[PDB]
Amino acid sequence: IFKVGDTVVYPHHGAALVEAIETRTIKGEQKEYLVLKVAQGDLTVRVPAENAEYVGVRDVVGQEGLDKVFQVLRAPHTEEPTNWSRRYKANLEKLASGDVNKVAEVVRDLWRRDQERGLSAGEKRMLAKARQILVGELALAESTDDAKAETILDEVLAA
DNA sequence: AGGCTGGCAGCAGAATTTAACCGGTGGCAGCAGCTGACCACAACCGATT
């Protein structure tokens, strides 16, 4: 499926350019690896081509995905558990899934709650992580000028 | 049939992994609103030599 030069999305790290395809040997068989150059912390990720779907690597979403995530990002009736730990584990396991809709849900919930009160060290760190990978995936989805994409996200969040 | 005493050997002391809400209360700290006494410059007196 994957080709050299494709821009795929890794689950917990956001965008990833597939820059080469290695052919390393483990247990005497040439399981080909693909190397991904993510840029969040400048790490090179190597995965087999077989377990790409098992680890859940995923192509970027289309314009139906864009209107779907904007539709879910502008939606009310988002009642949350009042317990701080329950809420934290809930949106952490939403963030770790790798779905654009779930990441947009986490950034809209924490954005409205930060606009309300301003939460915490851990939740501001989580909102920064989630919003930066959502901005990176959006800029990958439309080739649309990083930090101007941030202004786009701020505008569609503030509405 | 057992037992309690002799060297005997070993040991101790002394010297030179992760965080966050929520309630509620006492202390702080600053500031008009009186002060209520303090301070003072100046002027006005009470006999008295």
Question: How many of the other CB atoms lie within 10 Å of CB of A142?
Answer: 12
Residue A78 in contact with residue A33, Cβ under 8 Å? no
Burial A69-105 (b: 16+ CB within 10 A, else e): beeebeeeeeeeeeeeeebbeebeebbeebebbbbbb
Rg (CA), chain A: 17
Q: Considering only residues 4-43 of chain A, list those whose CB is below 7 Å from strand B.
A: none
Nucleotides of chain B touched by protein CB (<7 A): 19-22
Give Cα separations from A108 to A42, A55, A134, A156 (angstroms). Answer: 27, 26, 11, 10
A120 sits within 7 Å of strand B by its CB = yes
* Per-domain residue ranges of chain A: 1-59, 60-159
- Structure method: cryo-EM
Torsion angle of the four alpha carbons A65, A68, A69, A73, in this order, in degrees rounded to the nearest 10: 170
Experimental resolution (Å): 2.7
Nucleotide nearest to A120 (CA to C1'): B20
Give Cα separations from A103 to A33, A41, A54 (angstroms). Answer: 28, 19, 20
> Distance from CA of residue A153 to its chain's centroid?
14
Paired with A18 in beta bridges are A36
Q: Phi and psi dihedrals of A33, rounded to 5?
A: -105, 155
Question: How many of the other CB atoms lie within 10 Å of CB of A4?
Answer: 11
Could you tell me which of A34, A29, A9 has the C-alpha nearest to residue A136? A9
Query: What's the token pair of residue A12?
Result: 């917990």
A119 sits within 7 Å of strand B by its CB = yes
Distance CA A147, CA A30 (A): 42
A87 sits within 7 Å of strand B by its CB = no
